[PDB]
Amino acid sequence: FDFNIMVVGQSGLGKSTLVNTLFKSQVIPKTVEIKAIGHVIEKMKLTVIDTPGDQINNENCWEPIEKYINEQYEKFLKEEVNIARKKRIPDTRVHCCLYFISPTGHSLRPLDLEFMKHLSKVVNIIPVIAKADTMTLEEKSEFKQRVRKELEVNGIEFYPQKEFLEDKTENDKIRQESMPFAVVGSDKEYQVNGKRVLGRKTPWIIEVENLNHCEFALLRDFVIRTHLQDLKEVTHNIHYETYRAKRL
């Protein structure tokens, strides 16, 4: 049982911080290279892939990531044939990928859109709003609506895709309102209300998991519990298949 998550997006959005907060939940310098850390603990081995980048010229800035993803597929295609005859086949393909969106309060940057368009064709992308704590209530509500609109209008198929029922009753909910998940990621534990909790120490404490504070708990449950398998299935049966099909 192996699950791979990857964080993508602009620099300085708390992508790296989230990775660690994510790991501390189930259980910070600047990213320069694509390094993926995996924790062999819940049965499951969850490895999260970090990334940097956000420059004077950003032409084809996605290729590096696309090369990596495609690199993981080719590897699985070579390892899909059980030459070593192993009961289980190691899978390092990117199942779920989170694209961090700067909460600019305006329309999505052209670069964000194109970047998501390319990846959506090759990987399961789940839109996320970084540093949600920055935005006000009315602001965040409107920003999500703006995001959902801009995405749908730009023909960006993101998980859960409409194409691939009880699930249809919930996919609409997760497509329709909840997403993109607005997250606050804090690596620090502070005892709040009698128990150790994770949260930002804003002079104003904000609880990373508290459903009343932010949607991190929702996103976490969504990717690690509810849709953990669906992600893997769509990765293998659609994306990966499409790769080898074009390859062969």
Ligand X SMILES: Nc1nc2c(ncn2[C@@H]2O[C@H](COP(=O)(O)OP(=O)(O)O)[C@@H](O)[C@H]2O)c(=O)[nH]1
Structure tokens at 181: 């998940």
Give dist(CA 157, CA 121) in Å, integer.
8
Q: Does 59 bind its own copies (CB under 8 A)?
A: yes
For the bound state, the minimum distance from the C-beta of residue 37 to its own copies, rounded and expressed in Å, comes to 19
Q: What string of H, E and C letters represents the secondary structure of 158-170?
A: CCCCCCCCHHHHH
**Whether the Cβ atoms of residue 160 and residue 174 lie closer than 8 Å to each other:** yes
Instruction: Give the binding site for Mg ion (CB under 5 A).
Output: 16, 31
The option from Mg ion, its own copies, ligand X, none interacting with 185 (CB < 5 to 8 A, set by class) reads ligand X
The CA angle 172-173-177, to the nearest 5 degrees, is: 110
Q: Is 178 in the site for ligand X (CB under 6 A)?
A: no
77 vs 189: CA distance, rounded Å: 42
Kindly write out the interface string for residues 6-35 of this chain, putting x where it contacts its own copies by CB under 8 A and - elsewhere. -----xxx----------------x-----
| Residue of 43, 62, 28, 81 lying closest to 187 (CA atoms) | 28
Identify residues 16-35 at the interface with ligand X (CB under 6 A).
16-17, 28, 30-31
- Is position 203 an interface residue for its own copies (rule: CB under 8 A)? yes
Q: Could you list the residues that contact its own copies (CB under 8 A)?
A: 11-13, 30, 54-59, 102-107, 109-111, 114, 131, 133-134, 136-137, 200-204, 206
Extract the annotated binding site for GTP: 9-16, 31, 131-139, 185, 200
